[PDB]
């Protein structure tokens, strides 16, 4: 488990609210305001999920071995999906393909369509480690990433993007490819 995590008293999951003014809080704030300077951050929480982390890191080492595979991306969701995501992560079962979507810019996940405001006006987006690895442009109807070689349909790309030259979003089609690291609660 990461050293910068706080003690979880032999628990496997906990949300650790960050302290403003500290490097950790500010680093995340900086990546958000970089494109969302008009929004007001209410709080930032470090998601400490021992189980999700384990599966993700296993996935990461497999990808490093099989091929710079990790990207820090954004994911805005409604309030109701937050509890599930904290515990279980991102599910494709819940358009450049039918997987989970993650934005390069926080501005993109800030849209009400994504970070849908709750009755109190709060919006939610995750700061996510995503295993984008080797990618290709996507297309609707993808249920899995395309094969690197059409004549070896089992060697797959790790993710897809909207535009390979200037990626603004990535899509992953498997469970343990995204780790929600922080949850940003913010308002207008």
Binding interface with ligand P34 (CB under 6 A): 74-77, 101-103, 108-109, 113-114, 169
CB of 70 to ligand P34, least distance (A): 17
Binding segment (CB under 8 A) for its own copies, from list 61-69, 100-108, 111-119, 128-136: 61-69
Binding segment (CB under 8 A) for its own copies, from list 89-97, 100-108, 112-120, 179-187: 89-97
Residue 133's nearest CA partner among 97, 186, 75, 172 is: 172
Nearer to ligand P34, 42 or 112 (CB): 112
Is 31 among the residues that bind its own copies (CB under 8 A)?
no
Contact criterion met (CB below 8 Å) for 128 and 179: yes
Is 92 among the residues that bind its own copies (CB under 8 A)?
yes
* 154, interface contact from its own copies, ligand P34, none, CB < 5-8 Å by kind: its own copies
CB of 54 to its own copies, least distance (A): 6
Is 105 among the residues that bind its own copies (CB under 8 A)?
no
Quickly list H helices, 67-182: 82-88, 106-109
Number of Cβ atoms within 10 Å of the Cβ of 82: 18
Backbone dihedral region for residue 103 (phi beyond 0: left; psi -120 to 50: alpha; all else: beta): beta
- R_g over Cα of the chain: 17
If you search the block for the tokens 């709080």, which residue do you land on? 43
Quickly list H helices, 67-154: 82-88, 106-109
Stretch 111-150 residues interacting with its own copies (CB under 8 A)? 143-144
CB of 93 to its own copies, least distance (A): 4
Distances (CA, A) of 77 to 22, 81, 95, 127, 133: 26, 6, 17, 12, 24
- Which residues of the chain form contacts with its own copies (CB under 8 A)? 12, 51, 54-55, 58-59, 62, 65-66, 83-84, 86-88, 91-94, 98, 143-144, 153-154, 156, 173-176
């Amino acid at each position: 488990l990461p050293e910068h995590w706080t003690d979880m008293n032999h628990q496997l999951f906990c949300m650790v609210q960050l302290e403003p003014g500290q490097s950790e809080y500010n680093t995340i704030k900086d990546k958000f305001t970089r494109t969302c300077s008009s929004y007001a951050i209410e709080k930032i929480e470090r998601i400490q999920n021992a189980f999700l982390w384990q599966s993700y890191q296993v996935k990461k080492r497999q990808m490093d071995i099989k091929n710079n595979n990790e990207r820090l991306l954004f994911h805005g969701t409604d309030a109701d999906s937050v509890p599930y995501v904290n515990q279980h992560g991102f599910n494709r079962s819940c358009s450049y393909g039918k997987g989970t979507y993650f934005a390069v810019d926080a501005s993109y996940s800030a849209k009400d369509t994504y970070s849908k405001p709750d009755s109190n006006g709060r919006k939610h987006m995750y700061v996510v480690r995503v295993l984008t690895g080797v990618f290709t442009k996507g297309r609707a109807g993808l249920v899995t990433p395309p094969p690197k070689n059409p004549h070896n349909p089992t060697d797959l790309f790790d993710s897809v993007t909207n535009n390979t030259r200037s990626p603004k979003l990535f899509v992953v089609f498997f469970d343990n490819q995204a780790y929600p690291e922080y949850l940003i609660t913010f308002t207008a």
